[PDB]
Write a protein that binds this ligand. Structure first.
Ligand SMILES: COc1c(C[C@@H](C)O)c2c3c(C[C@@H](C)O)c(OC)c(=O)c4c(O)cc(OC)c(c5c(O)cc(O)c(c1=O)c52)c43
Ligand SMILES: O=C(O)CNC(=O)C(=O)O
Ligand SMILES: [Cu+2]
Length: 288
């Protein structure tokens, strides 16, 4: 198909009932209220070469990994995957150094999971992760700084912040994507006044620990299915990677942040889409 027209979940203003806390990995997040809008998502399979991290903030690349089982977090983090992702990412970006923070594995079907968790209290944590069905950027400009100093040593963070740096997510499906693909929005089609800093909390080890803290962009709804420029690539395989730019320190016109969201297509079929998204810092110690 050349495109789809699908309902997307955008920011609901608090004056109209919305809240400002994204309770990551909870049943409650699946119940969050959004301003829904229908947008056009252009299929770009066969046109991937036309999109890059500098202009649009995303790129589809061919990249073979040696890892096949992505469900075991410990197996992934000790194994070679992070280094494989980091070498690809430096190759693509021309970066000077790449530091992999971690990854999130997603394997649940959204609607299946809604109904199994219909009786669950909101703060119940799902075993596994559902797709990310809301428009967001994983880090605000503030959230990117917060992440840099939380995930890197203090001296390291201070120095790398003097040179150009960026947060890029490396999204790879476990197998050929036949349902709930991932859509990315042209960074240039959304303005700064549409971006809203939003708290993102992960209540790991409650009540012994405070929930983990992160700051996202929420996105104001468009007024037109084509105002925001949405794209995706059908049938993404585990030998292909979607690089999504969440943040870039460069303030000179280069794509700085990419709203993104999964979405169901009417032709969805098969067992639930499964994927990993690997959060990465990217440093160009020769710039800025
Ligand atoms: C496996 O460990 C989890 C991760 C680790 C990272 C590597 O993915 C979590 C994320 C963190 C860690 C912070 C909150 O301390 C991010 O900072 C790196 C991050 O940028 C992220 C993200 O922007 C979107 C998210 O999902 C929408 C997840 C998040 C999630 O919502 C629920 C989850 O259960 C949690 C994890 O348990 C992840 C968070
Ligand atoms: O895979 C999904 O359903 C959503 N993933 C993301 O938004 C991401 O990789 O940051
Ligand atoms: Cu995301």
């Amino acid at each position: 198909k050349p495109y789809y027209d699908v309902e997307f979940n955008y920011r609901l203003d608090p004056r109209d009932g919305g809240d400002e806390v994204i309770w990551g990995g909870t049943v409650g997040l699946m119940r969050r209220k959004y301003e829904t809008r229908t947008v056009r998502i252009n299929n770009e399979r066969g046109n991937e070469h036309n999109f890059n991290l500098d202009t649009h903030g995303f790129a589809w690349v061919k990249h073979k990994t040696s890892v096949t089982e992505f469900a075991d977090y410990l197996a992934i983090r000790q194994g070679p995957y992070y280094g494989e992702v980091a070498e690809m990412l430096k190759r693509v970006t021309g970066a000077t150094k790449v530091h992999v923070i971690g990854h999130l594995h997603r394997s649940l079907n959204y609607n299946d999971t809604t109904e199994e968790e219909k009786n669950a209290p909101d703060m119940t944590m799902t075993k596994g992760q559902t797709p990310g069905r809301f428009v967001h950027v994983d880090q605000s400009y503030q959230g990117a700084v917060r992440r840099l100093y939380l995930d890197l040593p203090q001296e390291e963070a201070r120095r790398l912040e003097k040179t150009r740096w960026a947060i890029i997510n490396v999204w790879r499906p476990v197998r050929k994507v036949t349902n709930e693909p991932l859509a990315v929005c042209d960074a240039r089609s959304v303005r700064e006044d549409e971006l809203f800093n939003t708290l993102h909390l992960v209540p790991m080890r409650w009540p012994d620990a405070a929930p983990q803290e992160n700051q996202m962009w929420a996105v104001a709804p468009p007024k037109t299915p084509t105002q925001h420029k949405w794209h995706y690539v059908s049938g993404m395989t585990e030998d292909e990677a979607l690089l999504i730019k969440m943040f870039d320190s460069k303030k000179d016109g280069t794509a700085r942040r990419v709203p993104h969201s999964s979405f169901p297509t009417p032709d969805d079929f098969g067992e639930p889409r499964a994927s990993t998204e690997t959060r990465c810092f990217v440093f160009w110690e020769d710039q800025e």
